[PDB]
Structures are given as C-alpha cells and as structure tokens.
Amino acid sequence: MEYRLKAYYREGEKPSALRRAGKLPGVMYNRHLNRKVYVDLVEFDKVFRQASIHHVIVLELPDGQSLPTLVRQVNLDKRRRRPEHVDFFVLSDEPVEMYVPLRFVEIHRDILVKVSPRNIPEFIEVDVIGDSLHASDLKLPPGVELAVSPEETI
C-alpha cells in the first residue's frame, strides 16, 4: 500500500476497440459518482497483481483528481483468461466492506472487514494439521469489524 494508476474517461468508444487497442474498459463509482473509464491494460496488470483488491489504488484522472479506489470486481474472458472489465470503487470516508489479507505467526487467505478508509490495514496476523480455529478468535486492529459470522473456519 498504496499504488497509482493512470485512468482516462471514455464515452462512446467501443470496448472492443479499446480492448483491441490494448486498454481495459472500466467503471468508477460510489454513492456520489459514476464514470466510464479505461486504464491501459499492461499498466493495470502490474499494479493489480500487487494491489489485488486488498490495497488502495489511487486513480490519476487527467483532470487533476487523484481519487482513491479499491478494485471491487474484475470480469474475465473465460476463454483467454484475460481481464475484460474493472469496477473501481471510489473510496470516501464512509465505512466500506473489503477483504483484508491474513498472515499467520490455512483455509482463508483473507477476511471480509467493515472499516473506514482511514483505518485500512495491510495485515491481520494469526497464530500457532489437522487443527484449525475460527474468525471469532481473531486480532481486529483499531477500526475493523469481522464482516462475517464467526462460524467461519480458518
């Protein structure tokens, strides 16, 4: 955390023309906006492989705005195994739900958390086959709330 990605607005360009032009059709939304965007495909690839829906990506739209977003959806073309659309969720102060990784001192790689965008952690640390514990017994740093039923096995 965190990363930056150029992002440009689109209106009537065909997604097929953009995809053929090496770009990634996408959308930007929250409670207050909704914009059709596109990122450059290769640029997005090297950010998302690291940022991966857990970590914040700041979009640098040409109009000067640096809007902080979380990737909320990536539809893939099932034949080619290539992304074909991205949902960038514009983060603002209101509390959001997101997936936070889990690093252990192994079912769930991450966990769903209700948090404010200020308090977005990088880690949630775990402890010490076949044994296992549940999300009930978990760390919960400042600002974060277990966004499931603790009946989840980890």
Contacting residues toward another protein, per CB under 8 A: 48-49, 52-53, 71, 73-74, 76-79, 81, 83, 109-110
Q: Residues for the chain: how many in total?
A: 154
Which residues bind to Mg ion, rule: CB under 5 A?
45, 87
Count, residues near RNA per rule CB under 7 A = 22
The smaller minimum CB distance to Mg ion, of residues 97 and 122, is found at 97
Closest contact distance (angstroms) between CB of 78 and another protein is 4
Which of RNA, Mg ion, another protein, none does residue 76 bind (CB under 5 to 8 Å by kind)? Answer: another protein
List residues near RNA by CB under 7 A.
15-16, 25-27, 29-31, 34, 36, 72-73, 75, 77, 79, 84-85, 87, 89, 94, 96-97
